[PDB]
Amino acid sequence: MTVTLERRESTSLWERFCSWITSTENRLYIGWFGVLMIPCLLTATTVFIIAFIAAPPVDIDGIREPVSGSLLYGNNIITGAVVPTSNAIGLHLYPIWEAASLDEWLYNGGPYQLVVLHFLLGVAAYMGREWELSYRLGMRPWICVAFSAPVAAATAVFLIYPIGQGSFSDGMPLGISGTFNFMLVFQAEHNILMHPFHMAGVAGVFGGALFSAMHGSLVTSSLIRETTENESPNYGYKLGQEEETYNIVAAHGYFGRLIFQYASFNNSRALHFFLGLWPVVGIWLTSIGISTMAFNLNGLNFNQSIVDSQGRVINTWADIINRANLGIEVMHERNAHNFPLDLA
Amino acid sequence: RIDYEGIGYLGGGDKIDVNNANVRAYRKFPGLYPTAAKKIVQGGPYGTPDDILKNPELSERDKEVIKKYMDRFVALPPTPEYFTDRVNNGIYK
Amino acid sequence: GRSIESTGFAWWSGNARLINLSGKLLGAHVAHAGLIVFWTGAMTLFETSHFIPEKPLYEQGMILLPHLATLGWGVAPGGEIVNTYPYFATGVIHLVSSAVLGFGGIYHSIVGPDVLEDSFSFFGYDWRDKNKMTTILGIHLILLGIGAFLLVIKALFIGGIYDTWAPGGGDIRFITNPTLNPAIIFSYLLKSPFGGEGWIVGVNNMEDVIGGHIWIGVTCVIGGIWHILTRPFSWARRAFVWSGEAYLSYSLGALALMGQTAAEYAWYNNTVYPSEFYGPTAAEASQAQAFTFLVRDQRLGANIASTQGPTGLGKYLMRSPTGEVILGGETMRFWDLRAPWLEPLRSSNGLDLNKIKNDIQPWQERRAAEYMTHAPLGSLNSVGGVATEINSVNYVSPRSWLTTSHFFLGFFIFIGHLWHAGRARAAAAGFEKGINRENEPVLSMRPLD
Amino acid sequence: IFRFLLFLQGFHNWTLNPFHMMGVAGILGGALLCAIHGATVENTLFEDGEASDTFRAFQSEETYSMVTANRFWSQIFGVAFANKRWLHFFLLFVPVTGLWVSSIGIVGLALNLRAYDFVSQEIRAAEDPEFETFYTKNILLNEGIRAWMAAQDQPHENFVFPEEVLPRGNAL
Amino acid sequence: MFTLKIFVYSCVAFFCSLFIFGFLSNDPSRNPNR
Amino acid sequence: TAQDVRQLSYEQVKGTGLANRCPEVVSSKGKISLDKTKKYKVVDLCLEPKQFLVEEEEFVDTKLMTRATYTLANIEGELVNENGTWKFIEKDGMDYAATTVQIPGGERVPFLFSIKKLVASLNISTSTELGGEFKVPSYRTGMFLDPKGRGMANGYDMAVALPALEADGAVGQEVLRKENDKVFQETSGRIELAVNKVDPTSNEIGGVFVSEQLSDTDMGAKEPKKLLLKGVFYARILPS
Amino acid sequence: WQVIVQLVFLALIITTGPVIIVYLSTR
Amino acid sequence: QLPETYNIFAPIIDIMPVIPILFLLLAFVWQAAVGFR
Ligand code: CLA
Ligand code: CLA
Ligand code: CLA
Ligand code: CLA
Ligand SMILES: CCCCCCCCCCCCCCCC(=O)OC[C@H](COP(=O)(O)OC[C@@H](O)CO)OC(=O)CCCCCCCCCCCCCCC
Ligand SMILES: CC1=C(/C=C/C(C)=C/C=C/C(C)=C/C=C/C=C(C)/C=C/C=C(C)/C=C/C2=C(C)CCCC2(C)C)C(C)(C)CCC1
């Protein structure tokens, strides 16, 4: 009697089912988390494809001005999108069976809500699934944490921000141009560039790419001669071999002479931990930034912070970026606002 | 429309088109905002500026101030485009 | 053991050295509680010290005082903070208690025994002892129930609680008839979290709040007794991982969920979080703007029920998708708002147009102006307003601080839950330190293709 | 730098440029590769010690199981690496390529040779006032940016835009 | 529309039940060290 | 049902859909007196469509796209006997509603269900009938902008995305003139109510309405379509 | 003159930590 | 504000809530003093 109860239950039908579900012999692993994931992602995918190709225009801002997002309605790959649900609906659950017809549903942006909810569910289940297979194969279980960062980002832009703003119409559009729109408006109303968490995110992705290129170049540089000339050096490695394929000492030495001796890593485990940690933390912080700005704790405001002796404002770059922000603000959703302050 | 002849009488000029201009325009002449302007808009439109004074529910104060700025008024033909927004024309600051 | 050689953990993961040391672990917990109560007291005294009599709480960056005011201490009808002394009292009490808990913490951490299983048998435990764990769980559950009943007692008998829905404006009231009807309470529990529903965040009267705490008190007490006097069934014993880290992970998941729930309470609810103290919600402020300019323009002679906006929708008044008469513009998304300054104008089919035309009161206009001018929007350096606003108003709504902070906390706490749950599984099965070079599972598996 | 960014958005529609999109692909892909490689190696480690601190337990022998990793990602994602050399080259290649491509784009913008518009949608929208995409919405956004900031960002030009000519929507 | 609701409810209840009761079937024992 | 609605609370109605329904009158007997000397006023006028027909080149049935946001209510008017004939002159209230239907083929037909400036002659018993003409303003107003920033009272005055088109003398952007010259087009649908229920004790009338009307033109860019609304109405008679 | 009091109190607390550590470091 | 009595104790209270942070930092000091960290 310790921690795990090591015991079985004798070739029962339900036990056979549990065995097949949790089987590590399946080409694609289908854990319990997969019992959630597969149907959700399939529904989401089907509705997404069909809508991206043939869905009628959607009244996104509830002002009876439908926006066209599908290919068969004059869009291309870059401009096509699944338009977010109507602002008249807000955060109300709008399933197909709550509409009078599929046509109404399409008009108010039901597809977006459906796809977003199903996708978030299925992706959470995807995270859980990564853990699950790690456990079934006797691995360490922290890949799903790493993947928890992107899940957090998706959850931020598809769920939390609509919650803070009171409408799924503020959720990120499922499309390229729509994404850009989301970004611009977000900058106008939260000044995300001046938010330290977004700066942390940029550090995460720039730094991530940097360390990717760095590690890659270092290991590629110190590959051990196992191949002939003009032949692919990749052939000099075989899957499953125990011998290391590159000179780690030579790489550490190079890096040591590039900057200084104590700037380099000696422990590969430490190095790869760092490689995993930097971008994941960055993205974590940016996701938090998107959600907390979803509750209007915006980026740093230095508008007219510098004054002269007489009391006149001396502009800085923050004032210029504020000018651009103003442009986006006054220009976005031209027919949606009736009152001078944009509080929603 | 692309072209409108009576644009100058909408607030940015010296005279006010009583039939089309927004209440804000009447802030140009002391005494008219908000009460006199309100009654003026609510009583429009008018064939001639003087018809403003023919409006019931106008106080003697209203009529006084209005006479003064009677020399300041014009009655262009009412166009619904501006007529509909005589109180709130979507302009703030 | 307090080294890498003696424990296996490094100085960072230093705290993992306390997993099987009951004494020092207890010391850590007690000292930590000491820190919590410390902060409570110190910050309360800080807020009392910085408070200014003739300003609203939400203009002064207060998060603790609004709680006490909500409970009904030092409040006049309308939400006026008159007596700031009970706040001082609670702050002092907490602080001194922090001295006590601090002493106990340092004692059990450094001075006392490392293992409480030797010298004692009641305060000693093995993580793998299910009965003992369910006993402790039961005790603390009973404690929580007692706390819920403390709130209930405070609201039913001792002065009462601040009711923003009180017939005559916000005022402290003794809840005479709490809601004990299961249909209603558990109607909250089994309700959608989406718009117009709000799950448990949609509670809008103190009868249901206090009654809910009666139910949760009874439930916690009965459950505590249940776990103290029983042992976990077979299925639970088979389904769960029984170790300290696992329990930690469970509590982490729970606290993440709770963090999110609290953030949502702070952001949408204005009953348990009176707008007089915490400030208006986003919804409330947007609706307040629409209301404000509806009043202004109606006073300028516009028939608002007939005023056509640029889109063709009502400029001031339109309909919700289910027919209710609502305020126009973007705030159409916020038509689920319920506020004591607006409900006087509410009818069966939504907003009553007649009451809008005739019965709008000056205090309502003042409320709308105040709230639309104190919307929960502001920068990180507390510059009030939208992102493009200039430096003049020093303001960030308490709702924003609370909600954002607790989202941050709930989020990272969830991360911790994943981490410790995973490591709990891996440590239980026995491969948390790496793959066995002599027992690699994959090598004993048939290839995928 | 933030100003330079919003400037290139408002004036060049830089987000719409395919080369920039390739750049974004390069960076985000790079960060993805960094994270996933780090996590994978850290979670396929061999037990080469007794301490929970697996860092201390680290030779020509691989410190992590390539086969187990391959199995895992093959059953999770459908496809996995099998060649360490190809892997490390790949996470060299992705970000570097990103940077180069975006550079092509920027040269383009040096000559104002932009990917600013989709003529088809501009013509359609010109003839049909009911036709709207997120592209056109962003075009409007660009116009706003340009006016307002134009006056403050280029002081030497002595741009004077009366408040009546500044493009904006209702109320705002 | 109601029949659609019934269908979707059936599916959701089905997969949710499989998930819950599935993860209750001694999942920690499902490891290579058992 | 007016008493029923009066007894109901907001929380009992909110979300049900009742808020968009017109009250009924459970009485088909009695008459409301009308002294041809005294002035009257119709109050709480509420029409509730049920049928939306759009004519195609006969009227065809459509699908409602904009849910329960189409009923007019609390509309206000003077009931004055002019030269012996009874006239109802609509004034205040919620006398308009933008609603969008969908005709076969998928084309969205938006329109402004209006009853503004209604003058309706009366021909009050269960045989009384109300018939008459009405103004329907432009679907969009002056400040509204198209996806390229063009409107009536504001916006660009040209196709600003095509500077090379607007660059030569004569023609010009004259082609796109039809889309650069936004027009406020007031039209007329024309209604025809028809009573059927009268409660003399509460002075309440209700019964059928027919309405005809004219519809959305995209600021003068496209030809409007005729729309057909078949419904019930409710009102009360209140002395001046 | 309140700022000096604040900074003195701050200095005393801040120093309080390390002093306890140093004191115990001698024994 | 504070009660008039304890008025004199205003500046000290201004530093009171910053103390838990110090404790966190203190941990590191302790560790650095030992030989770890
Ligand atoms: C209920 C709360 C709780 C408890 C009791 C524990 C307990 C434990 N955790 Mg844990 N953890 C938690 C929440 C919690 N965690 C959360 C929410 C996360 C997600 C962020 C984690 C993530 C985590 C990891 C990744 C690891 C642990 C580990 C451990 C074990 C050793 C911890 C240690 O030595 O700390 C040492 C403390 C420090 C090194 C201090 C770090 C301070 C952080 C990085 C900065 C935080 C910023 C802070 C808010 C303020 C900034 C400072 C500014 C004012 C200057 C121990 C059993 C370790 C383990 O598994 O061992 C078995 C381990 O590797 N934890
Ligand atoms: C639930 C937590 C919480 C909340 C909601 C607030 C809210 C508030 N506090 Mg308060 N406070 C708190 C905790 C909290 N505080 C604690 C714990 C202390 C003790 C130090 C204080 C001490 C304090 C003082 C002394 C004062 C306030 C004040 C205020 C007000 C203005 C806050 C401000 O400017 O923030 C500034 C916000 C920041 C600096 C952001 C912090 C950055 C975060 C922590 C992220 C960094 C961590 C990093 C990313 C983690 C790494 C992740 C890793 C795991 C990988 C506001 C009402 C002021 C006021 O007006 O009161 C009257 C004031 O004077 N507070
Ligand atoms: C019957 C036995 C018993 C009792 C009465 C308690 C009681 C308590 N334990 Mg505890 N504990 C026990 C057995 C018991 N424990 C055992 C066997 C273990 C394993 C060794 C622990 C391990 C343990 C830890 C690790 C911790 C506690 C803590 C606590 C306190 C919770 C404070 C709080 O916020 O709760 C919620 C509080 C309320 C809802 C308010 C009302 C609560 C009641 C009505 C009065 C509280 C007054 C005051 C705090 C203490 C008096 C309690 C006493 C008169 C019952 C509480 C005093 C925590 C603490 O901070 O201790 C100081 C903590 O961190 N306990
Ligand atoms: C303080 C919190 C607490 C904790 C940690 C536990 C812990 C435990 N209880 Mg327990 N219990 C508690 C309070 C608590 N209880 C209370 C207050 C009561 C009632 C008075 C009970 C009544 C109870 C019984 C009757 C039994 C347990 C059992 C158990 C054990 C198995 C747990 C399990 O499988 O859960 C899994 C639980 C579920 C799958 C139930 C699902 C909950 C339903 C669906 C309602 C939730 C829907 C809600 C509206 C939505 C929530 C939102 C959320 C999903 C985001 C475990 C040790 C069992 C055991 O082993 O015997 C001792 C057992 O038979 N408990
Ligand atoms: C239910 C489970 C659902 C799982 C999600 C589905 C995942 C689908 C993954 C498809 C990968 C295809 C790889 C082809 C190429 C291929 O077959 O490569 C196979 C290759 C195997 O590499 P080896 O190590 O065997 O190579 C050794 C030598 O051949 C090298 O020259 O895998 C990789 O290189 C790792 C990188 C794959 C990651 C690629 C990500 C691309 C994402 C898709 C981007 C476009 C999407 C457009 C959508 C409109
Ligand atoms: C374990 C450990 C740790 C921790 C520790 C802790 C956390 C502790 C805590 C402690 C505590 C938590 C303490 C507390 C204390 C408190 C006090 C000491 C209080 C006092 C009070 C007072 C003094 C008051 C006064 C007054 C009054 C009476 C009223 C009026 C005002 C005045 C101010 C005058 C560490 C990590 C570091 C490491 C080592 C080990």
Ligand SMILES: CC1=C(/C=C/C(C)=C/C=C/C(C)=C/C=C/C=C(C)/C=C/C=C(C)/C=C/C2=C(C)CCCC2(C)C)C(C)(C)CCC1
């Ligand atoms: C006071 C108050 C109230 C009331 C409240 C209440 C009465 C509550 C209750 C609540 C509750 C009553 C809750 C519950 C919850 C539950 C949960 C949350 C569950 C969870 C579960 C879990 C976590 C599980 C998991 C799992 C699975 C699923 C698989 C297998 C394994 C395991 C077992 C792990 C009202 C609203 C009136 C008002 C406001 C205030």
Ligand SMILES: CC1=C(/C=C/C(C)=C\C=C/C(C)=C/C=C/C=C(C)/C=C/C=C(C)/C=C/C2=C(C)CCCC2(C)C)C(C)(C)CCC1
């Ligand atoms: C209640 C009260 C009291 C008490 C107080 C206390 C309890 C205090 C404490 C205090 C404390 C508790 C302090 C502490 C501090 C700590 C520190 C000061 C630490 C650290 C710092 C630093 C700066 C560090 C740095 C570093 C290292 C060394 C390692 C890592 C790296 C680095 C560089 C970061 C008295 C008596 C006044 C009376 C009145 C009231």
Ligand code: OEX
């Ligand atoms: O929906 Mn999409 O964006 Ca958020 O802010 Mn208010 O609402 Mn509308 O304006 Mn700005």
Ligand SMILES: [Ca+2]
């Ligand atoms: Ca008849």
Ligand SMILES: [Cl-]
């Ligand atoms: Cl608005």
Ligand SMILES: [Fe+3]
């Ligand atoms: Fe590597």
